[PDB]
Structure 1
């Protein structure tokens, strides 16, 4: 009911990002949505004196047949002043966590006058026929980093009774999402979630406990071929960059000679001992692996085939903070890009739960393909940063 002064970082102008082309159905959907929001005063039309722009597109969330308006506030977010809560380290330790969309609440708080011109967006026209319908926000917009910061006081006032009632439930807020962690039963968790949503009304099952870090495992065989031993030495030599005392000379001693790849080689006793010591070393965690809030999180994804994908979140090379294997099959058996996009969304969600920020992705995809199709399968309210790797990494099969 009272606007809080918001400004930009010193020396930075407002965002001026090109609106990318949209299909006719998404354009019409945005026309209906923005017409309704204009009737509700949440947005207002602007004139040509507003040179700033932020991209916009339309998606469809899970279990819904209604379109939703998605704004790519990445540039405005990085250009918006830094607002100033320590991240809950217990949210990732909880048994279950539920994600709620509390974006509508932001629309009840007006936006600072002089800042509104920085939220300008354009509904594009097909074939550049019309100049495009230009809008700016009058309330807190969903996707902007200032919306949760400004609404934080009101959110604390709304969640104060529920927090005082259940001190065993951890509540976190990131962007337009509310993460509610507990240790109850799935039925009790769903009834409690309905309790919280009806509590918020009058004013996504996720289980981190079924998630752990993945160790480097070595094969257990009774007979080893030359190729088997070569791959084992390769993987151990790769792991020696992460683990110090990895030793491979007794296993490479077996490869002496020019033998056929499919020839079985019996392991000497020194080779068995070396391999056992290497197993023991790999069973231990990595030495000196810490998280630094001042550094960026990097996520790497490898396509393993048959709907399987591997990923690693780290900050320094060979110092993995998280590793995982997303192999879920959800209506994307014939589309690599949809699978990759869902994987990026899940990894970003896990990163939000663990560290409270999104990582920078290294995607195994050509820039043009990804930039052409990723919005067709996006369903989250946030968007991470990403880059593209064009050289096939050798370590792929070492995470398989």
Structure 2
């Protein structure tokens, strides 16, 4: 059976075929293998070969507890064969599927064995059925199951086979995925069944069998962790385990399932649990759960208590995305066309840095949504965002990094995204001027943070187990604590300057968080920088006060 053209296949340059000897099998397995191989030889799938075939690949037979199955171990051959154009890893997203009136699922029986294998390559597929004394030599004529090239070559072959039928039927949408075809149309159910039958016979003309009965799979369709209904889609039931102790592996599977749930369950928070997963040790060890992780998991359970579904896509309707804050660095979003009918949902809880602010994270969320939208629908959505033009404009204008803001409408739905504080751009008249400095011994880890002001005020606070950077931040914090509502602050630390000028409203470190609370409580704060050890004036006094001691 060679109506299907073969794909030319070569081994990796400098490599020869596999010569893995056949492991000894029991008599029953030998019998089963003999019968199965005679049936396959009868169908032209394999052929008995001469004695001078130097190559061999181990063969096995089993029946997972009635039927027997032949499994071949092509690991060596696979390692010795060329690379192919990568088979589709990515699956279509249900929220991207366009609602059809009629839908059919076709399972291709014995997919690989229906496609011929390149002639010059068949000798490398040689396997041996063991004789009782010591054997029968065989080789494949079709795509072997478990071989490296089978999925891609079957894919290609199926595409080429489908091309004419698709050419004569442009009103029929055909998805191709592994050994499955998913066929949709808007024709009348009867003539849709007719078109399906035509496709079936056409495929049968190329040696591809389809379900003969009324097609084995009916709605809803269980597929890759999804439930596909006629008018809606959702995820398969997510069961979160309840354990006293948790290993790294358990937490990985947990955050896995929560990630999976987040695409349709709005409000899922995975962050604290992944914070637990920051211990990138072996997957064995027990990781103690943090209170925040407990609360997070509990809230997740509360969310997963209610059934949720998504709708399919309509190209004529606009694409709309909404974003809401979920608390400390966590965000959630909904993508829909009909106001309460979600195409899908999602989350965003990345800091990508020790410190950040709400507007930055919002912009990043918008970026993620944009990318995802391009991937799923091939277009960017309109944005309804809980932030005002003045806020965002001020931010992206003052932001030293280039950013892309879409067209969006302000939706007033608390909590609104806002600038909790804004540093002054000019020094403040009448406000006290704190010259600050922090120092630390890089050996004893002891340190001190101090200030000297223009009003003649001086102070030094001792610190244990710290570093110079943290002492500089500590110095800024000290200046905030002991000052009025308006304050000028001068530092020689480029580090601290960089952290404060970025104007964060959330942080990993509690010190920076305290500083943030202080900045929020203030009315006007101006931060200035000077080069250290230059005898500037004010800075030299605090240095001499705090650097040596």
Normalising by structure 2, report the TM-score.
0.33
Offset of 1:394 from its aligned partner? 39
- Whether contact under 8 Å (2:387, 2:417) holds in the other structure is no
The question of whether the paired residues in 1 share the 8 Å contact of 2:325 and 2:415 is answered with no
Contact preservation (8 Å) 1:53, 1:120:
yes
The aligned counterpart of 1:126 is: 132
Unaligned regions of 5+ residues in structure 2, if any? 86-90, 206-222, 423-549
CA distance in 1, matches of 2:360, 2:34: 26
Structure 1 residues 196 and 239, CA gap change in structure 2 (3 angstroms): closer
| Mapped partners of 1:328, 1:24: distance in 2 | 59
Any idea what the Cα deviations from partners look like across 1:144-196, whole Å, max 9, x if unmatched?
Answer: 34345445555334323543566676545555554557899999998876553
Using the TM superposition, give the Cα deviation of residue 308 of structure 1 relative to its aligned residue in structure 2, in angstroms: 31
Distance 1:53-1:358 versus aligned 2 partners, 3 A rule: farther
Greater alpha carbon shift after TM alignment, 373-382 vs 13-22: 373-382
Structure-1 residue corresponding to 2:96:
90
Rounded Cα–Cα distance in structure 2 between residues aligned with 1:57 and 1:33? 12
- CA apart distance, 1:42: 3.6
More RCO (CA 8 Å, sep 6+): 1
Would you say the 8 A contact 2:128–2:137 is kept in 1? yes
Separation in 2 of the partners of 1:282 and 1:25? 50
* Deviation at residue 54 of structure 1 after TM alignment: 2.9
Instruction: Note closer, same or farther for the CA distance 1:398–1:382 as it changes in structure 2 (3 Å cut).
Output: closer
Q: CA deviation at 1:135?
A: 0.9
Equivalent of 2:173, from 170, 174, 177?
A: 170
Contact residue 289 and residue 319 of structure 1 kept, 8 A? yes
Q: Is the 8 A contact 1:300 1:362 kept in 2?
A: yes
**Cα distance in 1 between the residues matched to 2:19 and 2:192:** 44
Segment of structure 1 superposing worse, 94-103 or 158-167: 94-103
Q: Is 1:364–1:390's contact at 8 Å kept on the other side of the alignment?
A: yes
Decide whether the 8 Å contact of 1:96 with 1:209 is kept in 2.
Answer: no
Q: In 1, distance between residues paired with 2:413 and 2:202?
A: 51
Q: 1:284 to 1:32 in 2, by over 3 A?
A: closer
Q: Residue 17 of structure 1: CA displacement?
A: 4.4
TM-aligned CA deviation for residue 119 of structure 1? 0.7
- Between the aligned partners of 2:253 and 2:162, the Cα distance in structure 1 is 55
Query: Shift in Å at residue 136 of structure 1?
Result: 1.1
Instruction: Give the number of the structure whose alpha-carbon radius of gyration is greater.
Output: 2
SS in structure 2 of the partner of residue 208 of structure 1: coil
CA 239–35 in structure 1, closer or farther in 2 if over 3 Å, else same = closer
Residue by residue over 1:55-93, the C-alpha shift from the partner in whole angstroms, topping out at 9 and shown as x without a partner, is: 43456799xx66554434344344321223999995799
3-state DSSP class of the match of 2:280? coil
1:396 to 403, 414, 418: 418
CA distance in 2 between counterparts of 1:145 and 1:173 reads 19
Distance 1:32 1:380 in 2: 69
Structure 1 residue runs without a partner (length 5+):
none
User: SS in structure 2 opposite 1:205?
Assistant: strand
For residues 29-72 of structure 1, the C-alpha deviation after alignment (integer angstroms, 9 at most, x for no partner) is: 3212322443454423335543433343456799xx66554434
CA contact (8 A) 2:336 2:343 kept: yes
Measured at CA, do residues 351 and 17 of structure 1 come closer, stay the same or move farther in structure 2, by a change above 3 Å? farther
Q: 1:126/1:67 Cα in 2 relative to 1: closer, same or farther (>3 Å)?
A: same
Which of 298, 315, 318 does residue 320 from structure 2 map onto? 298
Gap change, CA 1:197 and 1:283, over 3 Å in 2: same
Are the aligned partners of 2:322 and 2:335 in contact in 1 as well (CA < 8 Å)? yes
Per the TM alignment, residue 249 of structure 1 is displaced from its structure 2 partner at its CA by: 16
Cα separation, 2, equivalents of 1:191 and 1:143: 35
Cα offset, 1:247, TM superposition = 12
C-alpha RMSD of the superposition: 20.3
Q: Which moved more, 1:274-283 or 1:28-37?
A: 274-283
Number of the residue aligned with 2:522: none
| More deviation, 108-117/236-245 | 236-245
Q: Deviations over 1:199-240 (max 9, x none)?
A: 312399987998745899999999999999999999999999
Report the counterpart of residue 74 of structure 2 in structure 1. Answer: 73
User: Counterpart in 2 of 1:266?
Assistant: 288
- Alignment check: 8 A CA contact 1:169 1:180 kept: yes
For residues 196 and 337 of structure 1, do their structure 2 counterparts lie closer, same or farther at Cα, with a shift above 3 Å needed? farther
1:121 to partner: Cα distance: 1.6
Show the counterpart of 2:18.
15
- The worse-fitting range, judged by mean Cα deviation, of 343-352 and 84-93 is 343-352
* Distance 1:163-1:239 versus aligned 2 partners, 3 A rule: closer
Per mean C-alpha deviation after superposition, the further-off stretch among 333-342 and 134-143 is 333-342
SS of 1:322's equivalent in the other structure is: strand
1:374 matched to 2:375? The reply is: no
Aligned residue pairs total 395
* 1:261-301 CA-partner distances (Å, limit 9, x unpaired): 99999999999999998889999999999999999999999
SS of corresponding position for 1:398: coil
Alpha-carbon displacement from aligned partner over 1:317-362 (angstroms, at most 9, x marks no partner): 9999999999999999999999999999999999999999999999
Alpha-carbon distance change, 321 to 266 in structure 1, aligned in 2, over 3 angstroms: same
Do 1:97 and 1:206's aligned partners in 2 also have CA atoms closer than 8 Å?
no
Partner SS for 1:8 = coil
Please state how far the C-alpha of 1:7 moved relative to its aligned partner: 0.7
Residues 108 and 180 of structure 2 are in contact (CA less than 8 Å); yes or no, is this contact kept in structure 1? yes
Could you tell me whether the CA contact under 8 Å between 1:242 and 1:319 is conserved in 2? no
Assess, with a 3 A threshold, how the Cα gap between structure 1 residues 229 and 372 changes in structure 2: closer, same or farther. Answer: same
Q: TM-score, normalization: structure 1?
A: 0.42
1:54 counterpart = 2:40: no
Going from structure 1 to structure 2, the CA distance change for 1:242 and 1:145 (only over 3 Å counts) comes to same
Match of 1:208 in 2: 230
